[PDB]
Amino acid sequence: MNITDIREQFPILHQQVNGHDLVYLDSAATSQKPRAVIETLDKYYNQYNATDGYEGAREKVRKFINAKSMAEIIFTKGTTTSLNMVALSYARANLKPGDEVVITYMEHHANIIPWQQAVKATGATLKYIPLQEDGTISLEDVRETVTSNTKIVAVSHVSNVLGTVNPIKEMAKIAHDNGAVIVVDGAQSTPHMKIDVQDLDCDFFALSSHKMCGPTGVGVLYGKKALLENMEPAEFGGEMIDFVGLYESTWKELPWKFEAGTPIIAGAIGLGAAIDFLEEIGLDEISRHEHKLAAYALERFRQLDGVTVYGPEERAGLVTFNLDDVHPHDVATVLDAEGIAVRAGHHCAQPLMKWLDVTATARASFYLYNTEEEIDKLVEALQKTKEYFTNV
Amino acid sequence: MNITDIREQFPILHQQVNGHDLVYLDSAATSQKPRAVIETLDKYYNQYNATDGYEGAREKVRKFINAKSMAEIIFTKGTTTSLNMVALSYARANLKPGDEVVITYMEHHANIIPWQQAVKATGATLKYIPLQEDGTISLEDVRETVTSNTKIVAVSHVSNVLGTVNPIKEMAKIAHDNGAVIVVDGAQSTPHMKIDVQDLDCDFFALSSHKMCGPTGVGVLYGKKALLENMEPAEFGGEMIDFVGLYESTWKELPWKFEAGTPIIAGAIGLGAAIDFLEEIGLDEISRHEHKLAAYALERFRQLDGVTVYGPEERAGLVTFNLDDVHPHDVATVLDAEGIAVRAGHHCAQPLMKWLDVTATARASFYLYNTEEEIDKLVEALQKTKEYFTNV
Ligand SMILES: Cc1ncc(COP(=O)(O)O)c(/C=N/[C@H](C(=O)O)C(C)(C)S)c1O
Numbered sequence A, B: 001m002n003i004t005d006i007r008e009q010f011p012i013l014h015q016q017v018n019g020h021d022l023v024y025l026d027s028a029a030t031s032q033k034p035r036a037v038i039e040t041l042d043k044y045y046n047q048y049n050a051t052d053g054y055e056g057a058r059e060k061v062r063k064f065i066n067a068k069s070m071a072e073i074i075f076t077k078g079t080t081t082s083l084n085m086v087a088l089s090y091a092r093a094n095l096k097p098g099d100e101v102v103i104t105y106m107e108h109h110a111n112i113i114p115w116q117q118a119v120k121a122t123g124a125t126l127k128y129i130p131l132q133e134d135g136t137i138s139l140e141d142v143r144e145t146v147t148s149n150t151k152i153v154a155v156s157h158v159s160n161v162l163g164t165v166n167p168i169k170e171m172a173k174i175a176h177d178n179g180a181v182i183v184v185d186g187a188q189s190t191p192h193m194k195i196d197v198q199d200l201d202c203d204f205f206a207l208s209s210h211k212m213c214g215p216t217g218v219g220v221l222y223g224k225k226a227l228l229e230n231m232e233p234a235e236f237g238g239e240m241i242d243f244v245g246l247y248e249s250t251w252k253e254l255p256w257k258f259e260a261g262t263p264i265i266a267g268a269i270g271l272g273a274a275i276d277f278l279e280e281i282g283l284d285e286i287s288r289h290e291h292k293l294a295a296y297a298l299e300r301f302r303q304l305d306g307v308t309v310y311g312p313e314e315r316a317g318l319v320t321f322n323l324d325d326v327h328p329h330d331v332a333t334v335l336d337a338e339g340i341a342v343r344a345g346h347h348c349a350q351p352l353m354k355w356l357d358v359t360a361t362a363r364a365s366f367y368l369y370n371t372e373e374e375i376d377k378l379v380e381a382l383q384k385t386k387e388y389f390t391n392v
């Protein structure tokens, strides 16, 4: 895998910011898109037929995560919408008082609140697997937290703050043994490593196109055919209908049952081209590149005095940290001045922020186009920043 | 208003199809976008901050439809999502057995089925204002159909099939007199004429950005502040939260209560530029251009033997028709061969198709960049088509 060849593909990396080269370290929020993807979306904003392309893209998505059937690949507005859908069509119809839903402390808001509302409405109860010191889950902890009263476990595959890769294959086993389905938020895993939903045996899996070189506006919700068959739709209109009566309507078959309103043609075809691209590079190749960057970043961050890093040693390609004494918003500002783009904030993980005893953090995240030289620029600029602020 | 100057702004109109000039008559499905809008969206797919722009766009939308407050302008995924939201947060919480919801026979599926589900779930009843012969509603009919049991009236401002402009200001009065709110689907009105939600006194109003020179992926739901204040959110996650507890969360204030997940920054800023554009042309100017085209089209269509046109004389800028004997899909195919783009199908109006006793129709729709010369090309090609098929 050749980083020059790859970088040539992202016109945005040639952008100057304030006389410096863009150093783009916010992929966890949005990847950039290569020329192949860009050209594809340009094509679908001139004149067309289209649905060869649309269903073709569903097929590429299905093969990509190794789903058994296209009936199991639904296009949605985003991973937030995906998770809300499972909470409304699956959770609200399968929970009764006494039933438990268990999640983790590391979750995105969209993987917390929909379960909260589903539990309030059904009068069931919500439960949290506790975290280890280093921000990991242990299989012991899940084993203990899941009762044979647990109907749903929901978990991030990769944490967007800690970079922890959760043992989701094993958690699936533990959920099944207790009579539960597992719901996996794969927003942060799918861009960076092979996903095989059969081997993971997750019951639902959600991915975000804009994190994986595709357009925004488009997510995919995977669910097992059999679960999807019994779920009622969350949204109504457009093209999810078979017969519309005056009082009564019938739904289409899967997957179209779940796609109300106006098909996101360009977005899906775009996601498909993004998939074509990543596959031609190899996800394994990508993942090895990210392990190097992450080991490198964590080592060089240990050289810096009074910066805290959060999470485990083994990690996806991101590190969340704080400068002693300095506000993360301020760090982000100064790095911006130098053309270095990191994100500051709570990362829609308020619970987890409280758990780390912090109100905010900065985050640098890495993808297939980042390099060690960029990590050096980050470390040098963090140094320059610690000095610059101990001096006011 | 100068049509050459306007047409110069849409690069897509210079596109050749099969050695002919594009004749684009499917604006009711998607408008095209001018250079100003295109450049704007290009800008937000290079490197950025952003939220000056986002909230700025909400303000431009508010001034555009003359809402009292930004608290009343919610960004959504589309008019389908908008209508589903009102059905779930408003309808399902305000209907009891005995309550009526009344709609029309001309509605889009997304303005039928969500009310069907809301009524099934609350055990209330759904009712239909009957149509006149010419596809119009009469105020008598609404007066008769609304009882002081009616809690919600829902109506298309402009029909996507018939081109009928519904008397929504008056219907608002009739709904209020009976103790009901009105919900208006303005997908087909907003691109073509001034909207003033204070004068119309609608309780909710929904518009689609991609019909009005803006990007797709973005709708606006207007609701009266006071109604919105009591509605509970439909979706949970992202940035609609104030405090996230372990069991219990608080929402942000309006409008952010209603925007779960990841803000559609580029889309909103794009819609704002589309608004800037239309406003610099003048919506009145646009609307007068469309009346000429529509009168012209209906007159030239009357010259054609054995084509049926549907709807009234007074109309928005669209005509839906059928060739005697010829399948609309086939018409669309032949016109495509000549570079003329019309849409064929049921237009997500299955009930209305059944009412007109047809399984499908063809539709030509007009916007600020269309001309009489294009209508001539359509009429000539429809003639060429009637001959071509009486001959097989
Ligand atoms: C784990 C996880 N799940 C869901 C989302 C939301 O994805 P989407 O915007 O497609 O709704 C995200 C998006 N994360 C952004 C980020 O971490 O940069 C966010 C903080 C905007 S949520 C996420 O990390």
Ligand SMILES: Cc1ncc(COP(=O)(O)O)c(/C=N/[C@H](C(=O)O)C(C)(C)S)c1O
Residues within 6 Å of the ligand: A238, A261, A262, B028, B029, B030, B077, B078, B079, B080, B081, B108, B110, B156, B158, B159, B160, B185, B187, B188, B207, B208, B209, B219, B347, B348
């Ligand atoms: C009256 C009306 N209401 C809602 C919609 C759907 O708008 P949106 O795609 O933003 O969800 C539409 C979209 N109409 C297309 C059309 O008529 O071309 C459609 C048939 C795809 S729904 C519409 O006409």
